[PDB]
Write an enzyme that holds these catalytic residues in place. Structure first.
Site, PDB file in Angstrom:
ATOM      1  N   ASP A 114       0.800  -1.226   0.000  1.00 35.17           N
ATOM      2  CA  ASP A 114       0.000   0.000   0.000  1.00 35.17           C
ATOM      3  C   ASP A 114       0.833   1.277   0.000  1.00 35.17           C
ATOM      4  O   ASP A 114       0.315   2.353   0.303  1.00 35.17           O
ATOM      5  CB  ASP A 114      -0.963   0.022   1.207  1.00 35.17           C
ATOM      6  CG  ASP A 114      -2.230  -0.800   0.982  1.00 35.17           C
ATOM      7  OD1 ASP A 114      -2.384  -1.449  -0.083  1.00 35.17           O
ATOM      8  OD2 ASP A 114      -3.079  -0.790   1.896  1.00 35.17           O
ATOM      9  N   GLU A 156      -2.953  -5.800   1.098  1.00 36.20           N
ATOM     10  CA  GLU A 156      -3.580  -6.293  -0.135  1.00 36.20           C
ATOM     11  C   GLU A 156      -4.636  -7.394   0.029  1.00 36.20           C
ATOM     12  O   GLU A 156      -5.191  -7.898  -0.960  1.00 36.20           O
ATOM     13  CB  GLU A 156      -2.496  -6.808  -1.073  1.00 36.20           C
ATOM     14  CG  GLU A 156      -1.316  -5.850  -1.284  1.00 36.20           C
ATOM     15  CD  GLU A 156      -1.642  -4.718  -2.234  1.00 36.20           C
ATOM     16  OE1 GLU A 156      -2.796  -4.242  -2.251  1.00 36.20           O
ATOM     17  OE2 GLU A 156      -0.749  -4.310  -2.986  1.00 36.20           O
TER      18      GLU A 156
HETATM   19 MN   LIG Z   1      -0.542  -2.613  -3.995  1.00 33.16          MN
HETATM   20 MN   LIG Z   2      -5.068  -1.767   1.382  1.00 38.33          MN
END
Ligand SMILES: [Mn+2]
Ligand SMILES: [Mn+2]
Length: 191
Positions: free
Chosen positions: A17, A113
């Site tokens: 992220d 994720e």
């Molecule tokens: Mn990613």
């Molecule tokens: Mn996320």
DNA sequence: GCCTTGCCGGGTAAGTTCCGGCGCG
DNA sequence: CGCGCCGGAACTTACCCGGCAAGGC
């Protein structure tokens, strides 16, 4: 080594992220950023930042943790050439990760994720090789899994973790106390 | 008849890269 | 002069979410 586990957990979040950015500006100015983004303010201020600050102290990095509130997300940012190459060189060696690092990373990557309902156990990414590496570690941990092209529109693969191994995956990888425990694993068992 | 899981569309929570600033040798 | 920390936020999509249904026991 605990430093190693936290590093690996953090890398998981970053690679999921956030990112690692080598920036050139006018002129000939530069900048090196270690970044994690998240909508959740708590997650970034209460869970991620303390982990990062610890890593910063043990590495004697004298950059600060920045938190920028953007339109869609918070950004945890560390402007540091040293930390940048610390995580980059760690990423280069990702196939050399020992068991504790493997678990911590996967933990971090799932927080970033992963399927958060846990009704299903899925990890999304466009980086198939990344997923394959994770896939081998899971197999070697007795966790069965498949990788497929989930999103034809954008080219996103998913690693699906077999529901037949839900218990092993969750208490062994998501609820390990060898590494930073993710927010609702540390809620899963003080329930 | 229930479960696992491939595949899919919706749409937002992500990610990337510009800007202007400062301080350093 | 040439770099490397700071503070911000504009700019697009790669994720996550949740439905459907084929397949399997
Ligand atoms: Mn990613
Ligand atoms: Mn996320």
């Amino acid at each position: 080594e605990n430093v190693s586990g936290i590093s690996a957990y953090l890398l998981g979040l970053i690679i999921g992220d956030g990112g690692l950015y080598k920036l050139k500006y006018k002129g000939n100015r530069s900048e090196y950023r270690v970044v994690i983004t998240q909508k959740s303010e708590n997650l970034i201020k209460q869970h991620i930042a303390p982990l990062m600050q610890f890593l910063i102290d043990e590495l004697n990095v004298k950059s600060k943790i920045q938190i920028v509130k953007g339109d869609t997300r918070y950004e945890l940012r560390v402007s540091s050439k040293k930390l940048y190459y610390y995580f980059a060189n760690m990423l280069e060696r990702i196939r050399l990760f020992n068991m504790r690092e493997q678990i911590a990373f996967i933990k971090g990557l799932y927080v970033a994720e992963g399927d958060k309902t846990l009704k299903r156990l899925r990890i999304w990414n466009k980086n198939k090789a990344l997923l394959e590496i994770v896939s081998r570690w899971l197999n070697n941990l007795g966790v069965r899994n498949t990788i497929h092209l989930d999103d034809h529109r954008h080219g996103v693969y998913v690693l699906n973790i077999s529901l037949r191994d839900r218990i092993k995956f969750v208490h062994t990888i998501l609820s390990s106390h060898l590494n930073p425990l993710p927010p609702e694993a540390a809620a899963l068992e003080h329930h």
